[model samples]
Target: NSSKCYIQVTGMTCASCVANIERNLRREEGIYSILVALMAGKAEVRYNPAVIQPPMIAEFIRELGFGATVIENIEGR
Candidate 1:
């Protein structure tokens, strides 16, 4: 069930926050590509649903004392 998805994260304040987000997600399995905007406090990631899902990623953010949501902009392959 691996599919494409975008993520929007909230509650990031500094570069460390972005770094932490990048580190955790990058270390995670099934991540293909990821982009995090510290200034905007948002992250967009492409991952393998078979191994990981958007909810799990969002949970990670939640654990970091932040908020996250799944973006429904499905318009690509």
Candidate 2:
């Protein structure tokens, strides 16, 4: 099954931040897809349930110098 996580990842000042995050994040395992909304200051992370968890996604964004909070979790989709 797949899981979708809605994360509030703020602290981005420009669109470049979105691209950088999306680019790097796609290389990660289990992350099938992601959406970075610059104006919304949010991120949608879609991942394989077996290989990843929501907290891991949040931490990765934090490591990229953004504040990441898991606001919602939708599982088995």
Candidate 3:
């Protein structure tokens, strides 16, 4: 299974924050792509639902010491 989703991050304060997060996400097995907006304090990810999920991603990020929340699910064409 596969899925795409967006999440709004609340604790990022710098580009290093974005870099740290992007690096963290990239290390995850299910994640395909991840984009982080430092100013907006948001992170978007495309991932395999079977390999991982919104809740799992959130928890992983939480383990990295950041607050994570899924904004919504995105339909793939």
Candidate 4:
């Protein structure tokens, strides 16, 4: 099943930061879509729940040199 999650992110200083985050997230399994907002410091991710969880998503973001905290689930299957 697929799910969507919203998270707050820190340390996003430029557009490259957003690009880098999305790029790395795309490499992960189950990731469908990712939107990172530098101004809002938030990200929306859609993925397959069977393959990944919100915490794993946060960890992936953390690996990219940013901090991520799950805010809520936006939608799901």
Candidate 5:
């Protein structure tokens, strides 16, 4: 099973950052899908709850040198 979440990203200076995050996140086994929007500075990702959690998504992005936070109002998924 999979659940969706919205993550607010910071320190993204250009479209390349968007591409970087999207590409890496997709590579994650638990992350089923992701779309990063540079203009919006956010990413929507669908992930398998058993393998990953919402906070971990942000942590993944942060490990790439960007600031990330899992937005609220997206629990109970």
Candidate 6:
């Protein structure tokens, strides 16, 4: 089964920030879906563990000049 995580993303200032995040994450493999909420400063991502993990994902976001924190690991969702 895949893993779902809620990541608190920081440094986003506008709608384009959301778009940029989505675009970068989409380029990575194993990422099923990405939902970035600017106002809430978080992102809900569903991905395959066989291909990627939460920390690595967060690292990727940080590399993009943003802050990422794992809010929670969704077990069944």
Most accurate candidate by lDDT: 4
> What overall lDDT, based on C-alpha atoms, would model 2 receive against the true structure?
0.72
How do the residues 6-52 of candidate 2 rate in per-residue lDDT, one tens digit apiece?
77766655678777778767877888897566676777867776676
Full-model lDDT for every candidate: 0.67, 0.72, 0.73, 0.75, 0.74, 0.73
- TM-score for every candidate vs. truth? 0.73, 0.80, 0.79, 0.80, 0.78, 0.79
lDDT, candidate 5, residue 44?
Answer: 81
- Poorest 10 consecutive residues by lDDT, candidate 2: 68-77
**Residue-by-residue lDDT tens digits, candidate 4, 1-77:** 57777777776666787888888888779888886666767777777767776678888888867777776464554
Q: Which 10 consecutive positions of candidate 5 have the poorest summed lDDT?
A: 68-77
Q: Per-residue alpha-carbon lDDT of model 5 for 1-77, expressed as tens digits? A: 57677778776556787788888889887888885656656678887766776667778888878878776344445
Which 10 residues in a row give candidate 6 its minimum summed lDDT? 68-77
Give per-candidate clash totals.
0, 0, 0, 0, 0, 0
Please identify model 4 stretches exceeding 4 Å from their true place. Answer: 74-77
Residue 58 in model 6: shift from native, Å?
0.4
Question: Candidate 1 has which clashing residue pairs, if any?
Answer: none
Cα displacement (Å) at residue 51, model 5: 0.9
Error of 4 at 36 (Å): 2.8
RMSD in Å for model 5:
2.2
State the TM-score for model 2.
Answer: 0.80
